[PDB]
Amino acid sequence: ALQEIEFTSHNGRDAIQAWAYEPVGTPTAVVQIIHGLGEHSRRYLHMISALLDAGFVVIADDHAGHGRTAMQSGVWADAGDNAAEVVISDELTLQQQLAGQFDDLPWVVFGHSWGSMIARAMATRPGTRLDGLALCGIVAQPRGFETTLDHKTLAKAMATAPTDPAPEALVAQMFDGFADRLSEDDGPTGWVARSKEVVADHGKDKFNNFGAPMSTRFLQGLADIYAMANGDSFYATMPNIPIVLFAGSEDPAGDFGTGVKAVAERLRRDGHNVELHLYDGLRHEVHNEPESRADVESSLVTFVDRVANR
Amino acid sequence: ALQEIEFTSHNGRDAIQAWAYEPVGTPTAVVQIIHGLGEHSRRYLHMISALLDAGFVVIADDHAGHGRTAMQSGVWADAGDNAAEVVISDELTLQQQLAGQFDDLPWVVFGHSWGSMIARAMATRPGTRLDGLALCGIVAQPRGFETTLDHKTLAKAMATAPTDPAPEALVAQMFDGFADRLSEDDGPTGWVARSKEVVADHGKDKFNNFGAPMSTRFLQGLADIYAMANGDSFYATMPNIPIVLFAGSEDPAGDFGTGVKAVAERLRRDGHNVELHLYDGLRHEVHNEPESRADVESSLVTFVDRVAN
Numbered sequence A: 001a002l003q004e005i006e007f008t009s010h011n012g013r014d015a016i017q018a019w020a021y022e023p024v025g026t027p028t029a030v031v032q033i034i035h036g037l038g039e040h041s042r043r044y045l046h047m048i049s050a051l052l053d054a055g056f057v058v059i060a061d062d063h064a065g066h067g068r069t070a071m072q073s074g075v076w077a078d079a080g081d082n083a084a085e086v087v088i089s090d091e092l093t094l095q096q097q098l099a100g101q102f103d104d105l106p107w108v109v110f111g112h113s114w115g116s117m118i119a120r121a122m123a124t125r126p127g128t129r130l131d132g133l134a135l136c137g138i139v140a141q142p143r144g145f146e147t148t149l150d151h152k153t154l155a156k157a158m159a160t161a162p163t164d165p166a167p168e169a170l171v172a173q174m175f176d177g178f179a180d181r182l183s184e185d186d187g188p189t190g191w192v193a194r195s196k197e198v199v200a201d202h203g204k205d206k207f208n209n210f211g212a213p214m215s216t217r218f219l220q221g222l223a224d225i226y227a228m229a230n231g232d233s234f235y236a237t238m239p240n241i242p243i244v245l246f247a248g249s250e251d252p253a254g255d256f257g258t259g260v261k262a263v264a265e266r267l268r269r270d271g272h273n274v275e276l277h278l279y280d281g282l283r284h285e286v287h288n289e290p291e292s293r294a295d296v297e298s299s300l301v302t303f304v305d306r307v308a309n310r
Numbered sequence B: 001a002l003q004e005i006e007f008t009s010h011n012g013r014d015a016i017q018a019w020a021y022e023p024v025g026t027p028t029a030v031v032q033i034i035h036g037l038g039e040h041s042r043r044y045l046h047m048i049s050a051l052l053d054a055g056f057v058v059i060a061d062d063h064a065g066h067g068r069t070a071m072q073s074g075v076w077a078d079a080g081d082n083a084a085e086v087v088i089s090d091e092l093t094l095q096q097q098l099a100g101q102f103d104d105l106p107w108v109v110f111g112h113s114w115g116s117m118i119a120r121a122m123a124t125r126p127g128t129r130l131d132g133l134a135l136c137g138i139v140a141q142p143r144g145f146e147t148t149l150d151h152k153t154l155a156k157a158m159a160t161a162p163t164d165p166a167p168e169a170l171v172a173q174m175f176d177g178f179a180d181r182l183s184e185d186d187g188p189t190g191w192v193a194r195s196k197e198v199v200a201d202h203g204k205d206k207f208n209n210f211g212a213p214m215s216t217r218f219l220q221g222l223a224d225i226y227a228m229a230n231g232d233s234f235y236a237t238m239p240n241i242p243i244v245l246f247a248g249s250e251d252p253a254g255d256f257g258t259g260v261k262a263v264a265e266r267l268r269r270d271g272h273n274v275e276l277h278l279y280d281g282l283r284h285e286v287h288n289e290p291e292s293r294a295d296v297e298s299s300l301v302t303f304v305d306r307v308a309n
């Protein structure tokens, strides 16, 4: 069965475009897919179909500034003022669109890239449905967020011109490092995947519209959510639930595996239930890389089944 | 990649809701999925994913009176005057939404139930892109369309009240015998699948809205398209291209396999290339039945790869 869910964003502007996919039979879990920056939720068709095959409900939206939400609003790569809180709020609102339908099922959030940061930030909030946490394309300790991005220059841009296009230098600082292991054949988005076909499709897909200029306030929202996802409060408040981590060892977003290992090591030192899948030689989208897609999906199904059993 | 396509229907009322799904890489074929009565195209996610995995473009719409097209128009289970020609015209218009994108690829039409009748009618028309024909849930020589439906009664209703709701007695005649091998607990749509879970999901899906009352003119469109798909002109003008048939032996739409075997026998006697998959013990939706789904999909992929060869 299919549901179209729309709701007004926390930003008061966008009609958030959302879908729920129900399998035949009695489902055993809900999986919420939270897409990343410059993509959309219907890009996950293969994973959605795999999760339905496994007997799970799947629910996802196109976030503010993204995919169908942007197509219908006309506004790309901006989520309003307080962008981090807008997208966290909207992911919590999405959970409540199934209120009364699946109240006794376990709920797993799967978040990729920006979605991994949103999922991590949601975990710190009391209202959240979250019986397991699955992260992919994990943004953790990359040089740009950790060191290159000049917070004083960003604060100055926010004080004077928060709705202007993000200054080019600040965008370059935030993603400093993303091209470190790329050739000119790979192109500027080669970090997306080792698969040239995945990268070419990424650049073609009209519901990604990747590369639309971000506003200053949107860039502020990425710095904010990076802090919320990677800061002490995340580790201190992470609920006592199963966690799984998926990343490419060549993904700049996780500092080429080093950052993802640090996330796993800190959660494990504090006694958390942590499963780590680091794919050697693969880049950001390990759920789309032909080499790893089947292992990511099967691992995710086994993980959701383990959450449901507990 | 994903495309949203809309175009105005041949009926002049509906914004036909449609999608094109493009695989990563260089595709080798296009597969057009044509859904059946009371369902929608977004109910083929598993098949769409399988065909993308095989390197094919997939294109589909929600027909007039169906799925998102009905959700957006507010009109369910009516397609306007001349309903058969509306839905045939719209499937040809859908093909032209990819003009210039995949002009050198082979094009396979996959039609399920009403879609199998639309696909058969399209095959007879000049200009249709059609390198191979795949039919599922095949409506072929069932007792209701063949003999129970009273054409004189229908013609009187069409002459005086074509836009009014179809008389219930005529709807019952058209689908006479569809409950013949069901138990009471299978319920009135038990013919959909042996799987009770498939049937329950069919009855719950908001984009099916199954059971919305048909207009008289829509019923007439089903009789019309039945005759276009099963009549002499179909057999006489079907192009000499690969054909594959999928059906359950317990599907009333194909007279419990008898009708489908006769379609295959007539096409073969006429010199056609016919591949027949008749699934014993399974009902209408052999592409959804858990027993047969993987076989239908893997057989479709092999077929499309043979059309491409």
Ligand SMILES: C[C@@H](O)Cc1ccccc1
Pocket (backbone or CB within 6 Å): A036, A037, A038, A112, A113, A114, A115, A139, A175, A253
């Ligand atoms: C953080 C993730 O969403 C990955 C990403 C980095 C730069 C641009 C788009 C995406």
Ligand SMILES: C[C@@H](O)Cc1ccccc1
Pocket (backbone or CB within 6 Å): B036, B037, B038, B112, B113, B114, B115, B139, B175, B253
């Ligand atoms: C003809 C096919 O679309 C099958 C069918 C028969 C009766 C009602 C709905 C669907």
